[PDB]
C-alpha cells in the first residue's frame, strides 16, 4: 500500500518531471521578459505542467524514505508527513499554486508575474539528480561535474539577457538604452534578432570580454551593470576552482611517477653510482608504474583480511596445488595456507638472489624464465635453471644454510613469495608437515 | 575592579563599536569626494563617534587579556598598560583625535581633509572579529571567509570610485575628464547619478571588463588608473586563490570514495576476477562510505584513549551485559573489559565465516539476520542461525579449532568483534574467568 | 616476417608521419577559408599527403603491439587486425579517403570541403607522441605539458580566425561585417594582411582583451561570437589549472623546509629555549636540507631490500673493510653484515656523544675531524680525539657502560652508525666474532 | 691569498652590483627608445658601468667556492677558471663589452642598440639573490617571493611600453598608428606625457582590461600585439598560480582543526551521545589547537634522539629532581631517566583517571588543581587532592591494582606522564631502585 522508492514506476516518474522542470526553467524568463500572455496557446501548456506538479505534491505522501541512523526502510506512514511537511511542502505548494491564470479569470500585472517567477523553486529536482550521480557509481564523476556547471552557467546567460531586455523596454526614450542607442528601431524586428542581440550582449560581460558596444545609458540600467559584473566575477572565480580541480586530479599519478624517477636520479648521481645499479633503480620503478601496484598495496590493506582471502584463493589456489614440494597436504590445510601470500613481479637482468646470500623468503615462479650462473668461486658458464611452476629456495626450509646459486632473470617474470618467518608462522599447522618434510627427504635424495 | 574579557557587557560594547567602525569606514570616502564640510548635520554625528571612540581609549586599560605562555588571565592593572602602550595606542590616539573640529574651530583645507583620512585605522576591530569568527567554533567557516572577501571588494569599489570623482571635480577643464567628455553637464545633476556613475566606472575595471566608456585623458588621471590596475590584478589574483581553497576543500570527500572505486575495479579488471568477489569489494567499499569510518578511525585514534573508554562504556555496555556467555563477571571487570571492543558494520550478502577457516575473532550480533549454510561438505540446505544478540564464535574461545559453519549475511548488521588476541589479553584478569568457563561448560552440555 | 614495433625503420616513420600531420593541420583551415580550389600546386601536395597516409593503412597490419595482461609482445597476425579493424580503422579510412579529388574529376562545393574538414582525424598521432613523451624518461615533464597546452591554443586562434573571415567573405552587404565596417576596400587587399587582421581579431577575444574593433554586425555572426566565446572560457579556465599544477608542484620543496623551520622556531620560543638547543635543531634542519635525506629515506624503503644491499655494498664496504676492530673477518661475513649499515651527516658543533650516556649505537668516522672534552668531571681541556676511519662507541660492544668522553665536531663530517640492536643481531653469526673479541681484548689491552 | 666567499667585503661588493644591475635595466628599453645618443651625460654613467662590471670579471677568478659533493670549500685556483669559464664567462664578456661607445668613436645606428640590448644578461644576479634569499632563514617566505613577481610584472610593462612607443615613431604617417590617431600633435611633447602614456597603454593589455582607446593600425603594430598578448596570458596564469600557493599555505592550519572539529561532531551527533562525551571531545580538540602539539609530535619525531634528550634534560629535571618519591637518586641515573619522558597538557573538568581503572601511567602535576571525588561507592564528597609537583599514580608502581579514587580537574593543568612500560624499562638500572622501594615502604607507612 506504499510505495517502493526503488521501483520502476517512481524513478521514471521522476526523470519525466525533470524534463518538465528544464522545460519549465527554461520558458519562464522568455516569458517574463518577450512575449505577452493574453494569448493562450502555451498557457495551455503552463497550466497542464501545473497540474502535474500539483499530481506530484499529493503522491509524495506515499513514497517512503531513508533514514539516517536505521537504514534500509522507513514505512507506515507516521513520518513521512512529518519529514515532507516540515522540510519541503511550504515552497512546493507556494510554487505549484497558480496566480496568473487566477489573475486572468478573476478581474484582469508586473506584480502577478513576479508571483510566477515562484516556478523557479522546482528547479530543486535538477540539484537532487546532481548529487545522485555523482555519488552513483555508473557514471564518469569528472563528467557530471563540468555538465553542472555548463548548466549554472547557460541558465546565468539567460536569465541575465532576458531581464535586461526587459528594462530596456519599460524604458521612456527608446534612445539612451543599450539597444536603442545602436539599433533605432528595434521593436519592430523579431524574436531571434532581439533573443540573439540580448543573449550576444550578456555573453561578453559574462566572460569579461566588454568589446564596448551595448554600454549602459540609462541610471537603472547602469545600476543593474553593477550587481551582474559582481555576480559575473563570483561565479568565474568558482569555474576556475572546479577547473583546477579537474586539471590537479586528472595528471597526478604521471606526476608522482616522475617524482619518484628524479628522487632516485638525485640519490644516484649525488653518490656516483656507475651504471648498473641506476638500472637497476630506474627499471624497477618503470615496472611498479606499468603494474601499478601502490594502488594495489593500499587497497588490499584497506581491505577487512577476508576478501584478500578469497582473492588469493582464486588466484594463486591451483598454481600451489601443484608443486615439487606439495602432494598430498590436505586441502583444508591449503584454505589457510594460501591467504598469506604475497605477490610480486619483477624485470628482467635484475640479479634475483646472489651467491652465500643469507636466505630470506621461497620464490616460486609463475611465469619468465629464470637464469643461474656461479658467482665469485665461478668465473663463467656454470648451470642454474627454474621453469614455469618450478619452485626454487627450498635450500632454507630448515636448513638455514646459504643459497648456492646466483639468480638473474632472462625475461621478465611473476614470482610468488612465501617468506621465511610465513613458513615458520606455517610450522605450528602440525599434523601435515610430514608429508612436507618426506617430500624434502625424497626430494633432495634423488 | 578590573573588567574581564569575557563578561556580557564588554561584548555588546566591543559589537557595538564593531557597527561604529562600519559606519566611519563606509562615510570617510564619501564625506571626502562628494559633499562639502561647513554644514553641520552631519558634523554632530561625526563628533559624536569620535567622543565613544575616546570612552575606549580610557576603557581598554580596565580589561584583562589572555596571555601565550601561561594561560586564562592576566591582572594587576601592571603590564596591562606596558601591552596596551606598546601595541596599539599610537595609531588609535592618532586616529581618535579630532583635526577637522579644531580647523574649523581655530582659524578656518585638503591638507585637514588627509588628517581625515587616518579614521581608517578604527578598522583594525573588523580585522580581529574576523579572526575571532573563524576560530569560534559555532559559525560556518567558509561563510565568514566569503563575507571578508566581498566586504573587502566593495570597499575598494567604493575608495576608488570616489577618489577618481575626486580628481575629476579638481581639475580645470571639465572637458577631457573621465565623466566630462561624456556628460558635458554633469556637476548640476544629484548625488545618485553621480554616485552611481563613478560606482559603475569602478566595478568595469575592477571586475576587468572595460567597455569603452569612461577612459582617462587627463594625465594625472591617467596616472592614477595605472595604480588602481595594478592593484585590481592583485585583488583578482587573490580572489581566485580562496575560490579555489573552497572548492578543493568542498569535495574531497566525494573525490577521495571516487578514487576508491577506480583503484578497485582497476584491480579488480587486470586479474579477471569473475562477478561475485567484484560485487564483495565494490559494495563494501559503498558501506565504508555511507558509514564513514575512516574519519571516524582517524578521530578515535586521536584521542587520550580514556575518553574512548567512555564512549565504548556508554555504547556497548549494556549490549556485552547480556550474553549468552558472560552472566556474572563483576562489573568492575566489565569497565577494564569494554574499552577495547572495536565495533564494525556490514554488507548483506558477505560471507563473514566461512567452514573450515583457522579463527580469530568473536562476532557479537548488535542487529541484522545471520544465515549459515553448509559448506563443501554439504551442497545445499542445512541449518544455521544467530539473532539480535545472539553471539557466535564460541568455538574458538579455548578450542582453538575451525569454525563448523558458513556465516552469509542476510540483511546488514552491526557486529562486533572481541578478537583472539583481545580475549587472551584479557586472560590474565582471573577470578572472574572461572565463570566464563562454567558458563562454557554448562553452555555446551546442554 | 612481422614488424617490430621497436625498430629504428618505424619510429623515423612515425615521426615524418607526425611532421606530415602537422602540416595538414596547419593548412586545412587555411584552405578552407582564404584560397581557392581550382588551381593545383597545392592539389599536388595533398595528394601526396594522401598517398602517404595510404601507405600508413596498409602498413599498420604489419606491425606487432603490447598487450595489457600479458606483456612484451603479441604476435601471430590475427587478433592484430581485431584490434586494428575495432579501434581506428573506420576514420582513418574515412579521413585517408579523397572526396575533393574525385568531386573535382567527376563532375565538378562547399559540401565538399566539410568532407575535407575530416582530415583533422590524422590529428590523433600528436596525442600519442604527448602521451608518449610525458611517460617517457628522458624528457622534462613541466616542457612538455606546456608545450602541448600551446599548440591547443595557437590552433583554436587559428582555425576560429579563418572560420571567421570565411562567414565575412560569405555574406553579401560587404558593410556591416567586422572587417567591413572598418577597412570598406578588404577583398583587394593581399593575403598578409587579411590573415593578420583575422588573427588580430581572435587573439583579441580569446585573451579576452576585447578593445572594440571588429565587433560583430551580422547576426549569424553575432551567433557565432556566443560559440566561440564560451569555448574561450572554458579554454581559460583549463590553462589556468595546468599553470597552477606547474607553480604548486615547482616550489613544494623550500616551502616544506620553510614549514619545518617555522615550526621549530615556534616551538622553541615558545618554551623558552635559550640559544644553544635553537641553533642546534636550526642547524640540523638546514643540513637535512642540503643533503635532502627526506626524500632519500623515502626511496630507499621502497626499494625491494637487495637492490638496497648492493648499494650499501658499493658505497661502505671498503670502508668497514678497513677499521681498528675487523682484521681477518671472512668478506663471506661481510656481504651479510654490509646491507644493515644506516649512513647519516652531522652537524659542526653538535654535542654527538656525551659524558656518562647510556650507550645506544657504534660511531664509524668517514669524513671529518671529531674533538672529545671531559665533560662534568673536567671543567675545560682534557684529552679525546678519532680521525678518519678510526672508530669510537667501542666501549658498549658488550661493556654495557656508558661512555667515557665527550663528543662534539669541529668541522663537519659523515659518520656511520651500526647500533646496539643491529650488533647484537649480528651476533648468533658466529665462528667470526671469536675474531672481533680477540681484536677487542688485544685492542685495550695494549 | 684566495677571497673567500663569506667576507664582509664581497657581499656588499655584491650587493653594490645588484643596485647597479637595477640600474641597468631600468635604463636600457628607455635609452632604447625615447632619447638620443649624441649627447654624453649618461654616456659617462654608462661607461663607468661597464667599467664595475671589467672589474668584475677580474675579481671573479680570486673568489672560492661552494662544490656539491664534498662541502665547505674548493681552493687552490685549478678548477675555479674550469668552474667560471665554462658557466658563465661567455655571455658575461659579451656582455660587458662595449660596442656603441666603439661605434661612436670609431666612424659613426639601430643594428648598434640591438648589441647594447645584450647588457640585460646582467640580470642574472637578481635571480641569484631571489634563490638566496628563499633559502636563507632571517626572511619572510611569502615576501620574498609575491616581491619577485612584482618585480618580473612591472619590468614586462616597462619593456613592452617602451618598445611599443619605439614602433610609433619609427613609421611614416604619424596618424594610423596607437598614439597618433588620438593625438595628432604628440612628437612635440615632452617625456612624461609619452611615458605615462605608453604605460597606460601597456597596462591596461597586461591586466586585460582593454578599454579601447590606442588599439593599433600599422599592421606591423598589429602584428606586434599578438606576441604581447600571448605573453600576457601566460604570466597573468603563472600569476594565479603563485597566488594560489600563497592563499592554500597561509589558512592550512585554521582549515585543518575546523576539519577535526567537523569529523568530531559528525562522530557524536551520529550515535547520540548526550551532552558530556561531546563537551569533552571538542574542548579535548580545542585545546589541542590552542597549544599546537600535532607539529610539535612530527617536528620532536624527526629530532636525532639526542637533541630530544637535551631538550628534556632542560624542561623537566628540576621538576623531577624534586618529589615525594625520588630523594637521592644518583643525577647520573637521571639523565638517563628524563629522556623518555612525554609531557602533556589537559583541559579542566575532564575526569583524568576514574575509579577501579586498570593502571596504565604516572601523572606527575607541574601546576593546575586536581580534584579527586569517590566514584561509584560514594554518590557524593568525600576527598581528594594533589598539588603543584605532587604526583599520584603511585598505587600502580609494583602493587599492580587499580586506582582508589576519581581524578577530576578544576583549573587547567599540565601533567606529565612516565607510563607503567617506561617505569618497568627502567627497572633493570637497578642498585638506585631500592631507594625508590624504600622511599615507597616509609612513604606508605607513614
Ligand atoms: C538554456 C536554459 C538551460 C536551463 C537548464 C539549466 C538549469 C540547471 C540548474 C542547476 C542548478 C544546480 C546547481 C547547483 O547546485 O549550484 C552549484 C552552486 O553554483 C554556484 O557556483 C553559485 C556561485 C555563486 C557566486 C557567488 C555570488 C557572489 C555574491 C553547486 O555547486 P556544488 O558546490 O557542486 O554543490
Ligand atoms: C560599502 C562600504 C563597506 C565597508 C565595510 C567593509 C570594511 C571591511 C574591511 C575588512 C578588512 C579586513 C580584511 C583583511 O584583513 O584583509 C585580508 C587581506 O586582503 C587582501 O587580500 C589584500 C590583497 C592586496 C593585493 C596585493 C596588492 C598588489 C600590489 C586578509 O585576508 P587573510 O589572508 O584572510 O588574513
Ligand atoms: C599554427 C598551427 C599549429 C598547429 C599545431 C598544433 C596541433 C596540436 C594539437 C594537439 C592536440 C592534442 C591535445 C589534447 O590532447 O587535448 C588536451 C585537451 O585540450 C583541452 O583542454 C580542451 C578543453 C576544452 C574546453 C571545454 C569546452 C567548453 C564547452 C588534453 O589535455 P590532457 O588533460 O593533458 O590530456
Ligand atoms: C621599473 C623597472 C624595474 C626593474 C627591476 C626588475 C628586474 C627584476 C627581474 C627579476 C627576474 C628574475 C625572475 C625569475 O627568475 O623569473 C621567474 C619566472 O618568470 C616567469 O614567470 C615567466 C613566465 C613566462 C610566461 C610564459 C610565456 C608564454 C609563451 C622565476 O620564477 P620561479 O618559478 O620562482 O623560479
Ligand atoms: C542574475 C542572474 C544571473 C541570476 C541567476 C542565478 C541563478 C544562478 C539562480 C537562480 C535561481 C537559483 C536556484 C533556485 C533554488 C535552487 C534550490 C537549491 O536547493 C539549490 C540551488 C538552486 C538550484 C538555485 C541555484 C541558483 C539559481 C539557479
Ligand atoms: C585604492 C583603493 C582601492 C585602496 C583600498 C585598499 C583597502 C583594501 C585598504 C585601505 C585601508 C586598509 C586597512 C587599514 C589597516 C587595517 C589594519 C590591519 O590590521 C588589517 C588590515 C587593514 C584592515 C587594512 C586592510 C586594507 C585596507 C582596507
Ligand atoms: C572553434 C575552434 C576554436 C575549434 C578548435 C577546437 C580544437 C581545439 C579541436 C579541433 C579538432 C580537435 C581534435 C580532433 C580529434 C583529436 C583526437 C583525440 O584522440 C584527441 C583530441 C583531438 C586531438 C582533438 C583535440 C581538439 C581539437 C584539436
Ligand atoms: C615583451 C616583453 C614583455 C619581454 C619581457 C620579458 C622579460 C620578462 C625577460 C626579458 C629578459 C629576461 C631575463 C634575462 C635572462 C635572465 C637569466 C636567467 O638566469 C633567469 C631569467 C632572466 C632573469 C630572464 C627573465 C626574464 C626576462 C627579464
Known amino acids: 500500500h506504499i510505495i517502493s522508492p526503488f521501483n520502476p514506476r517512481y524513478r521514471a516518474w ?39 506538479f500539483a499530481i506530484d505534491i499529493i503522491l509524495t505522501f506515499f513514497v517512503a524514505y531513508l533514514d539516517s541512523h536505521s537504514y534500509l526502510l522507513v514505512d507506515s506512514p507516521k513520518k513521512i508527513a512529518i519529514r515532507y511537511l516540515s522540510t519541503w511542502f511550504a515552497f512546493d505548494v507556494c510554487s505549484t499554486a497558480p496566480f496568473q491564470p487566477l489573475s486572468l479569470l478573476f478581474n484582469y500585472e508586473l506584480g502577478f508575474r513576479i508571483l510566477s517567477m515562484l516556478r523557479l523553486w522546482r528547479l530543486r529536482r535538477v540539484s537532487s539528480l546532481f548529487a545522485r550521480l555523482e555519488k552513483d557509481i555508473r557514471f564518469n564523476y569528472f563528467w557530471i561535474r563540468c555538465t553542472k556547471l555548463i548548466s549554472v552557467t547557460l541558465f546565468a546567460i539567460h536569465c541575465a539577457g532576458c531581464f535586461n531586455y526587459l528594462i530596456a523596454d519599460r524604458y521612456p526614450n527608446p534612445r539612451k538604452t543599450w539597444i536603442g542607442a545602436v539599433y533605432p528601431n528595434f521593436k519592430e524586428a523579431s524574436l531571434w534578432n532581439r533573443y540573439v542581440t540580448a543573449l550576444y550582449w550578456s555573453i561578453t560581460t559574462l566572460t569579461t570580454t566588454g568589446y564596448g558596444d551595448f554600454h549602459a545609458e540609462n541610471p537603472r540600467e547602469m545600476l543593474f551593470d553593477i550587481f551582474f559584473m559582481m555576480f559575473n566575477l563570483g561565479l568565474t572565480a568558482y569555474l576556475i576552482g572546479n577547473m583546477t580541480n579537474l586539471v590537479v586530479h586528472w595528471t597526478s599519478r604521471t606526476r608522482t611517477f616522475r617524482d619518484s624517477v628524479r628522487a632516485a636520479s638525485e640519490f644516484a648521481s649525488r653518490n656516483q653510482l656507475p651504471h648498473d645499479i641506476q638500472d637497476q633503480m630506474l627499471s624497477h620503478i618503470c615496472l611498479k608504474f606499468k603494474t601499478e601496484g601502490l594502488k594495489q598495496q593500499e587497497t588490499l590493506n584497506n581491505l577487512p583480511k577476508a576478501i584478500r582471502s578469497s582473492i588469493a584463493n582464486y588466484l594463486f589456489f591451483p598454481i600451489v596445488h601443484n608443486i615439487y614440494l606439495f602432494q ?51 668465473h663463467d658458464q656454470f648451470q642454474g635453471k627454474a621453469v614455469i611452476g618450478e619452485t626454487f629456495g627450498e635450500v632454507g626450509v630448515l636448513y638455514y644454510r646459504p643459497q648456492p646459486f646466483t639468480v638473474r632473470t ?23 608437515d610430514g608429508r612436507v618434510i618426506m617430500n624434502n627427504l625424497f626430494m633432495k635424495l634423488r
Chains 1, 2, 3, 4 share one sequence.
Not at 23 to 48: L, R
Not at 354 to 372: K, M, R
Not at 412 to 429: E, F
Open 410 to 432: 632472462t625475461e621478465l617474470s611473476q614470482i610468488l613469495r612465501i617468506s621465511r618467518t610465513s613458513l615458520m608462522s606455517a610450522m605450528h599447522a602440525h599434523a601435515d
Open 14 to 52: 521522476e526523470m519525466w518531471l525533470v524534463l518538465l522542470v528544464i522545460y519549465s526553467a527554461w520558458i519562464c524568463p522568455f516569458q517574463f521578459a518577450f512575449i505577452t500572455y493574453k494569448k493562450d496557446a502555451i498557457f495551455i501548456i503552463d497550466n497542464i505542467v501545473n497540474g502535474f
Open 328 to 378: 598430498g597436504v590436505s586441502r583444508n590445510f591449503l584454505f589457510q595456507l594460501v591467504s598469506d601470500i604475497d605477490a610480486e613481479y619483477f624485470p628482467p637482468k635484475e640479479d634475483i638472489i646472489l651467491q652465500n646470500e643469507a636466505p630470506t623468503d621461497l620464490y616460486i615462479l609463475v611465469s619468465g624464465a629464470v637464469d643461474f650462473t656461479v658467482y665469485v668461486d665461478g
